[PDB]
Amino acid sequence: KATDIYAVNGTEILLPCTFSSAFGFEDLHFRWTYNSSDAFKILTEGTVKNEKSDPKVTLKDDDRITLVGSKMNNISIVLRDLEFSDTGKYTCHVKNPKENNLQHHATIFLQVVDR
Question: Can you give the residue range of the structural domain that contains 87?
Answer without folding.
Answer: 1-115
